[PDB]
Amino acid sequence: KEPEQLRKLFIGGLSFETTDESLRSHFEQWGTLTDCVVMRDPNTKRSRGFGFVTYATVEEVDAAMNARPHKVDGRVVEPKRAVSREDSQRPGAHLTVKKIFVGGIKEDTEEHHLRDYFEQYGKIEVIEIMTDKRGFAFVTFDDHDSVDKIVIQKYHTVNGHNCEVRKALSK
Amino acid sequence: PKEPEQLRKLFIGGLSFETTDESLRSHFEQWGTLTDCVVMRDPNTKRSRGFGFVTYATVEEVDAAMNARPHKVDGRVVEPKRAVSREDSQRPGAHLTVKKIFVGGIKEDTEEHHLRDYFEQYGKIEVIEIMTDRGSGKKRGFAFVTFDDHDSVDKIVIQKYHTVNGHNCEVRKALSKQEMAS
RNA sequence: AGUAGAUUAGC
RNA sequence: AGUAGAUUAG
């Protein structure tokens, strides 16, 4: 089957009223839910303002993301690809961005190589190979979910060779 | 439509210093087609650095090569391992040989057969141990699995996600009680 | 002494 | 409390 982590969305900005039951009845419009939970404060039992929805298939996850915007219990909420507990500890893991850093490209790698591999994740806006070639490049998408789909994957083969993918940064 | 290059690549450690790209190739193409084969050399001396990489066309061929250990290349037994990505190679101890993994993030209803059901596919299991807290009696949220061949572990840690009992869980090479307090 | 690729952070 | 799951080191 497909790994649980790839079938899970993080839902940001929940209302205090939002429950496992209310969250479920909304997001089950886009598929079957293997799990649906609001994270609550262990001591107060207040909602902590976010939850998780898990579909049976990644297709259903994709459908829910394609049906943005999402309003739950009177509140616009923010669904994003669920970053694993391990990757969540890395700085910038949770930023909403449209641009990725691509490092480890070989010297004969051209722009159409990068386009051929990254098209599958979403509409590409801009590709820029760094010149001085220094072995890295930048790709800009029009939808942050395109980036999120990319960084939850481990390997990326461009022109027959692995390369590392990171969210592009401000500093 | 291939399989990622990183999963098709083996690190070959301990090469004879006379081994070349071609001699390394003629040995390892006995187990399949090689999309690449290289001896790593020092940039200034051009001398061999004592290790290389071979990449097969399919991971199936990688498995065949690993199942044919030991491998003697140009008179010397070499040590082939799953090629750890440059990114993962930067963390301490990434290349140490272990048969035992730490498994963290298992739910309270996760049983011993759940762990065995998922990890069997990587190799013969020797020992599974779910950690229960003394003084409380219930599960602590992690476990340990011991395999019979380190390559089983190496095949596990080059994958990203591991769904045990319907939930993701993290896998790390196990360190000793001493090594951890440090 | 030894078996981890290093041209993987933009003007 | 209010947008990252600490029951993830024996």
Residue numbers in the entry:
A (entry chain B): 8 to 139, 145 to 183
B (entry chain A): 7 to 188
Sentences from the paper on this structure:
HnRNP A1 has two RNA recognition motif (RRM) domains, each harboring conserved RNP-1 and RNP-2 submotifs, and a C-terminal flexible glycine-rich tail, which includes the M9 sequence responsible for nuclear import and export. The RNA-binding region of hnRNP A1, comprising the tandem RRM1-RRM2 domains, is referred to as UP1 (Unwinding Protein 1)17. We have previously shown that hnRNP A1 acts as an auxiliary factor that promotes miR-18a biogenesis; however, the underlying molecular mechanisms are unknown. We show that hnRNP A1 specifically binds to pri-mir-18a through interactions involving both RRM domains in UP1 and a region comprising two UAG RNA sequence motifs in the terminal loop of pri-mir-18a and a flanking stem region.
To gain insight into the molecular details of pri-mir-18a recognition by UP1, we determined the crystal structure of the UP1/12-mer RNA complex at 2.5 Å resolution. The crystal structure reveals that each RRM domain in UP1 specifically recognizes one UAG motif in the RNA. Overall, the mode of RNA recognition by RRM1 and RRM2 is very similar; in each domain an AG dinucleotide is sandwiched between the β-sheet surface and a C-terminal helix. In addition to the stacking interactions with RNP residues (vide infra), the adenosine is specifically recognized by hydrogen bonds of its exocyclic NH2 group with the main chain carbonyl oxygen of residues Arg88 and Lys179 in RRM1 and RRM2, respectively. A positively charged residue in each domain, Arg55 in RRM1 and Arg146 in RRM2, makes electrostatic interactions with the phosphate backbone of the AG dinucleotide. Two charged residues in each domain, Glu85 and Lys87 in RRM1 and Glu176 and Arg178 in RRM2, contact the uridines in the UAG motifs (U3 and U8), while another charged residue, Lys15 in RRM1 and Lys106 in RRM2, interacts with G5 and G10, respectively, thereby recognizing the U and G residues in the UAG motif. Similarly, in RRM2 Phe108 (RNP-2 motif residue located on β1) and Phe150 (RNP-1 motif residue located on β3) stack with the bases of A9 and G10, respectively. However, the two RRM domains interact with each other and this intramolecular domain interface is stabilized by two conserved salt bridges (Arg75–Asp155 and Arg88–Asp157) as well as a small cluster of hydrophobic residues in the interface. Importantly, the molecular weight obtained for the UP1/12-mer complex (26.9 kDa) indicates a 1:1 complex (theoretical molecular weight: 26.3 kDa) and demonstrates that the 2:2 stoichiometry observed in the crystal structure is an artifact induced by the crystal environment. Although the stoichiometry does not reflect the solution conformation, the RNA-binding interface is expected to be conserved.
